[PDB]
Amino acid sequence: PVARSWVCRKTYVTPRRPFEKSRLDQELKLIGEYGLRNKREVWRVKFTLAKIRKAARELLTLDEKDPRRLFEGNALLRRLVRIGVLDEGKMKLDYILGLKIEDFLERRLQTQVFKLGLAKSIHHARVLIRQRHIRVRKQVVNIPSFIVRLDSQKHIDFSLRSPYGGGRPGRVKRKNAKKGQGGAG
Amino acid sequence: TVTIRTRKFMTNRLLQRKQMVIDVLHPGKATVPKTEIREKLAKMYKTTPDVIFVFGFRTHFGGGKTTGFGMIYDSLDYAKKNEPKHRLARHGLYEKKKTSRKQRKERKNRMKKVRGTAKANVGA
Amino acid sequence: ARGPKKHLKRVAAPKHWMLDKLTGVFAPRPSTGPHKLRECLPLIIFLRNRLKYALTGDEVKKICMQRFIKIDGKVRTDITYPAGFMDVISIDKTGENFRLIYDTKGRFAVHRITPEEAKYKLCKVRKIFVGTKGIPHLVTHDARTIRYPDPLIKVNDTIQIDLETGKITDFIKFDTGNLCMVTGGANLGRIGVITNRERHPGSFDVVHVKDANGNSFATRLSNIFVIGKGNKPWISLPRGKGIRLTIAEERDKRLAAKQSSG
RNA sequence: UGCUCGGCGCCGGCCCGAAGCGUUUACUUUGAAAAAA
RNA sequence: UGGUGACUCUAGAUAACCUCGGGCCGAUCGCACGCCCGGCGGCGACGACCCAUUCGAACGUCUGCCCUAUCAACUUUCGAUGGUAGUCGCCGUGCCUACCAUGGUGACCACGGGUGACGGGGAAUCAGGGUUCGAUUCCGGAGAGGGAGCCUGAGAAACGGCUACCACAUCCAAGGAAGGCAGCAGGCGCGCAAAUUACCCACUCCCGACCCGGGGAGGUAGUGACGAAAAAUAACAAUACAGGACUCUUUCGAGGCCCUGUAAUUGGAAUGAGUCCACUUUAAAUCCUUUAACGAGGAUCCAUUGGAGGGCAAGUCUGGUGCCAGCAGCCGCGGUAAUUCCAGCUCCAAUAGCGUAUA
RNA sequence: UACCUGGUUGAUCCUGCCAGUAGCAUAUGCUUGUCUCAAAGAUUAAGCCAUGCAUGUCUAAGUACGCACGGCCGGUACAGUGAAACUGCGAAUGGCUCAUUAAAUCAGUUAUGGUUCCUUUGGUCGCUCGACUUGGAUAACUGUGGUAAUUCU
């Protein structure tokens, strides 16, 4: 009898047909497009999409003017428009079934850093996010699997401890300057 | 250099102290030790560096803001009255014995092995 | 199991205590007292959670032993004393008083009261007892035995007593039309008006309670605690008035508060 | 669905309310009571 | 008098009893100390026959459990079914006695046997419908080698209490003493199978005459690839050249910004493991966060596991033995032209993880 | 995601099973940089255990003549802290295991009008018609012995 938690779940899912052409090439296309390490991340996004789709199907299996269906559907639409997957005009329960995985991956942190113009390439954006250079809402983030909300999208700048957007110069510049000063005299 | 702003502050006259939450804002520096926080909060509150007990300072990710808890008493006797002993030992106002619990347990078993006046001298 | 239990686990506690999961394996088992274990509130939980006057279990005991705690007008020095429903808590150091009554949902809520209101306590009689020499008795819900009551007091007629002596001051009859409180159950903490009552022989009687907004519900007879003479109550109701407003209106009010705040 | 007591109105009285009773079953629908994780 | 849906309920009245192994009817202790004229007073602590209340416990009512006919009749006055009157039990009743009648259950599965059976709240799988598991932190039940019997106590058939049995076993001058880790660490045995003879009452509670003492209940750290979540091993610029997205010399050629990809050509920008000062956390540290001084160009600071005929993504590559050695979950490859064996190159799959075997 | 593919024939349609494909929880094998949680002698043996620990407890309010410390004007005993011991309370809680048990345990719903209950809370405690404090025993202590040993006497 200890004070523990013992609660966990698997976030990704393994596909039924591992050995094929079409969606394997599609997942390679997604990895090479949006800059992902492996297929566990894209399987994680597919599992989240499957959970959202299952919740939407179990909402549509009920009837109109049901308080439970209306409450959970309004909460789901409000969360999905807070994330930024949907549009303000298309705030209905039937628009959930007509979205794809790249709608989720446009709100990823690396994609937003690359499309904000402050990064060179997608892999450069990923390795720059992982190396603690970019803050949001004056809080320095480290992780690239960051779902950027709609209200926290215009507050993505360089960190104040970074050698790019204002700060101390880095390790190799000071080392090169000290080496040049030692060699010159 | 170091900016302190208070929140969630309340005074309980039943425990004759003032408990509060201290946040430390140090931009781009190492975390401030508890002593400097003690005279900063003391000179903010116009109280001598004697009756302030702070604990549990955790630094957020990024090194820009820390959170902590602290209590300000009214007198040193009341600070010695209702306070845990380890913070008094941290301030050097209290000292505990250094004997381990295994020696105490074996001493208790040796004293329970005997009976009478022999408990004082046979059990160490 | 060769005797009574002395330890209570953390998840075995009732939900209205509102304990957390990671801080320990054990929970404060209350001492035996006026109220039942499943429906009570220990002084330690109320003091260290509802007002946060203490932080540890030793500090609330240092609070409690110094005779700064008055429950039902008498000084209590126990940390596991069950402070149940409708009890009064008096703090003479800070000049603040609390009355333990339910919220709109099934949990206890804090309720600041004036000291002049903190002199009486509504109690519900459980049974009518005759003594050893033809003398009438009365047993309340907190087992406070009162000798020589009014002879118009029936089996389920709530009374108003006084704390410092223990005498009967007033009472409210149990009739259809009086404002009522419910203790125990799924729809716990609702304010309504008693309209009907079914009499089932050999079983539990069920009454019908009508809310002020036209809502109607039902509960057992033993979960009925009448507090008012008709429509006007005797005790000041807290915020929300025990109305049991629905989930969608709760969300609408919460977003109204959020956009009003900013 | 009807045959002893009294109501929101009125002059021995109309209506309503009600102590009492008014085929048992399954099925179906609303409520209660239903430990926590 | 009072109540229940209902008393042989509570109370009222009369005539007795009331156990010496005995129901109560205060010979107990602190604090502040007092007014009236030796008596008279406040706040408590302890004990107490009684009632109600609180944690409960106990025996009952209705419904619900895996397999089996190579278990179709079972139990009976050494109680099986019911009746009368008693004993015991805290009461209710064959729970047990003395006397009575032969009753009770069963094909809608009794009875008998097995279980690799603690039961449930639950877990995995999952269109729908279902299958399997549940020793395992919560609830309830049973036991402390296994049967048996008890003292004390309100509550025990108690075993970190006692007595006797058998099985094993410690010390011994041999006359006698002392035994119970299916508690926390640890050893042997067993097995494919499972960790430290560590620290502390600070956090959560528990017990006591109780702010103050104790707690292997618990909390902390170590072992830890059972399993789960996140995620390093590189980015960019110029020279390496095949020409398109736009216009064009019948055709090379060329205007060519973004070029797109690639070779140990070069170049400055960079942070992380690790070494470590300090701060912080904590009963005191370590873990994490913060911050100085170090710290990457074969960034050796060197990423593995199985496969390359079909299912089943990926070579008629080369050399060797050539139905031998072997591969192969299934078809089948092995015969001196092996897309399957044994080595080197390239390539595909998940990638700090991958393959194999039993449920 | 309400999913199938190879194999009997000279070749073609079927029943059919074999083998692949995915999760799960036990062991084993190869390999290994950061960090947050976290299972762990359960399957065979409810087999045997050397060792150390796991249950003890005082306020103003039950007993204080241990100089073990210790206050003074000492004569209305007892200033105060006080080991030890008598007394009352808990040790029937917590912790471990799944060996018995197939209407047995347990689950939901009911009843004790057929009983008990430590402690807490509330009531009762001059309701009886008949000393301004009674008695002797034992601890602890002092002294003195047997045993090879015990929380033995």
Tokens 């030692």, located at residue: A182
Query: Chain E: nucleotides under 7 Å from a protein CB?
Result: 1-5, 10-12, 51-58, 137-142, 154-159, 198-207, 211-212, 214-219, 227-237, 268-272, 278-284, 289-292, 294-297, 312-313, 349-352
List of chain B residues whose C-beta atoms are within 8 Å of the C-beta of residue A140: 61-62, 64
Residue of C nearest to B69 (CA): C55
Tokens 């702003």, located at residue: B5
Helices (H), A35-161: 39-60, 67-83, 101-106, 109-115, 122-129
Amino acid occupying residue C217: F
Residue C134 CB coordination number (10 Å):
6
Residue B124 placed within a domain:
no
What lies within 8 Å, CB to CB, of B68 at 6+ separation is: B21, B22, B23, B24, B37, B54, B55, B56, B57, B58
- The CATH number given to whatever domain includes residue B66 is 3.30.70.3370
Please identify among residues 31-60 of chain A the ones whose CB lies closer than 8 Å to any CB of chain C. none
DSSP string, B1-64: --EEEEEEEEEETTTTEEEEEEEEE-TTSPPPPHHHHHHHHHHHHT--TTSEEEEEEEEPTTSS
Asked if A122 contacts A129 with a C-beta cutoff of 8 angstroms, the reply is no
Residue C171 CB coordination number (10 Å):
20
Asked if C227 contacts C158 with a C-beta cutoff of 8 angstroms, the reply is yes
Asked if A160 contacts B27 with a C-beta cutoff of 8 angstroms, the reply is yes
Residue B95 placed within a domain:
yes
CA B71 – CA B58 distance, rounded (Å): 17
Residue B42 placed within a domain:
yes
Asked if C36 contacts A17 with a C-beta cutoff of 8 angstroms, the reply is no
Handedness of CA C167, C170, C174, C179 (dihedral sign): negative
- A32-39 own/partner pairs: CB under 8 Å, 24+ apart: A33/A122, A34/A102, A34/A105, A34/A108, A34/A110, A34/A111, A34/A122, A35/A110, A35/A122, A35/A123, A35/A125, A35/A126
List of chain B residues whose C-beta atoms are within 8 Å of the C-beta of residue C89: none
Subunits touching B (CB < 8 Å, at least 3 pairs)? Answer: A, C
Breaks after residues in chain B, judged by C–N over 2.5 Å = none
Chain B span 100-119 residues with beta carbon within 7 Å of strand F: 102, 105-106, 108-109, 111-117, 119
What lies within 8 Å, CB to CB, of A82 at 6+ separation is: A149, A150, A151
What lies within 8 Å, CB to CB, of A72 at 6+ separation is: A55, A59
Q: Which two tokens mark A164?
A: 């790019």
Asked if A54 contacts A42 with a C-beta cutoff of 8 angstroms, the reply is no
Amino acid occupying residue C158: T
Q: Is A137 helix (H, G, I), strand (E, B) or coil?
A: coil
Nearest to B36 by CA among B79, B66, B61: B66
- Residue B55 burial class via C-beta count within 10 angstroms: exposed 0-12, middle 13-18, buried 19 and up: middle
Give residue B20's domain range: 3-113
What is the tally of structural domains in chain B? 1
Handedness of CA C31, C35, C37, C42 (dihedral sign): negative
CA C175 – CA C218 distance, rounded (Å): 16
Asked if C136 contacts C144 with a C-beta cutoff of 8 angstroms, the reply is no
Tell me, what DSSP letter sits at residue C90? Answer: E
Bridge-partner residues for C102, per DSSP? Answer: C108
Q: CA-CA distances (angstroms) from residue A101 to A46, A107, C71?
A: 7, 11, 61
List of chain A residues whose C-beta atoms are within 8 Å of the C-beta of residue B25: none
CA C92 – CA B16 distance, rounded (Å): 14
User: What's the CA angle centered on B87, arms B23 and B19, to 5 degrees?
Assistant: 45
Distance between first and last Cα of chain B: 56
CA C172 – CA A68 distance, rounded (Å): 41
Cβ <8 Å between B61 and A160: no
CA A31 – CA A41 distance, rounded (Å): 9
CA C75 – CA C93 distance, rounded (Å): 13
Residue B68 placed within a domain:
yes
Residue of B nearest to C61 (CA): B82
The gap between A30 CA and E314 C1' (Å) is 22
Residue B82 placed within a domain:
yes
Helices (H), C66-178: none
Residue C249 CB coordination number (10 Å):
10
Subunits touching C (CB < 8 Å, at least 3 pairs)? Answer: A, B
Nearest to A123 by CA among A27, A36, A30: A36
Residue A153 CB coordination number (10 Å):
13
Q: CA-CA distances (angstroms) from residue A140 to B57, B58, C234?
A: 20, 16, 57
Nearest to A131 by CA among A122, A121, A140: A140
Asked if B26 contacts B2 with a C-beta cutoff of 8 angstroms, the reply is yes
Residue B120 placed within a domain:
no
Asked if B14 contacts C91 with a C-beta cutoff of 8 angstroms, the reply is yes
Three-state secondary structure readout of B52-112: EEEEEEEECCCCCCEEEEEEEECCHHHHHHCCCHHHHHHCCCCCCCCCCHHHHHHHHHHHH
Q: How many inter-chain contacts (A to C, CB under 8 Å) are there? A: 18
Nearest to C32 by CA among C73, C69, C84: C84
CA C46 – CA C55 distance, rounded (Å): 12
Q: Which nucleotide is closest to the Cα of C145 by its C1'? A: F122
Is the CB of residue C247 less than 8 Å away from at least one CB of chain A?
yes
Q: CA-CA distances (angstroms) from residue A132 to A92, A141, A167?
A: 39, 7, 13
CA C10 – CA C21 distance, rounded (Å): 7
- A54-61 own/partner pairs: CB under 8 Å, 24+ apart: A56/A93, A56/A96, A56/A97, A57/A97, A59/A93, A60/A93, A60/A94, A60/A97
Asked if B124 contacts B116 with a C-beta cutoff of 8 angstroms, the reply is no
DSSP string, C113-140: E-TTTTTEEEE-EEEEEE-TTS-EEEEE
CA A57 – CA A51 distance, rounded (Å): 10
Handedness of CA B17, B18, B21, B27 (dihedral sign): negative
Tokens 């089932």, located at residue: C200
Q: Return the half-sphere exposure (C-beta side, CA atoms, 13 A cut-off) of residue A60.
A: 12
Residue B122 placed within a domain:
no
Q: Is C192 helix (H, G, I), strand (E, B) or coil?
A: strand
Nearest to C152 by CA among C133, C181, C177, C174: C174
Query: Chain D: nucleotides under 7 Å from a protein CB?
Result: 31-37
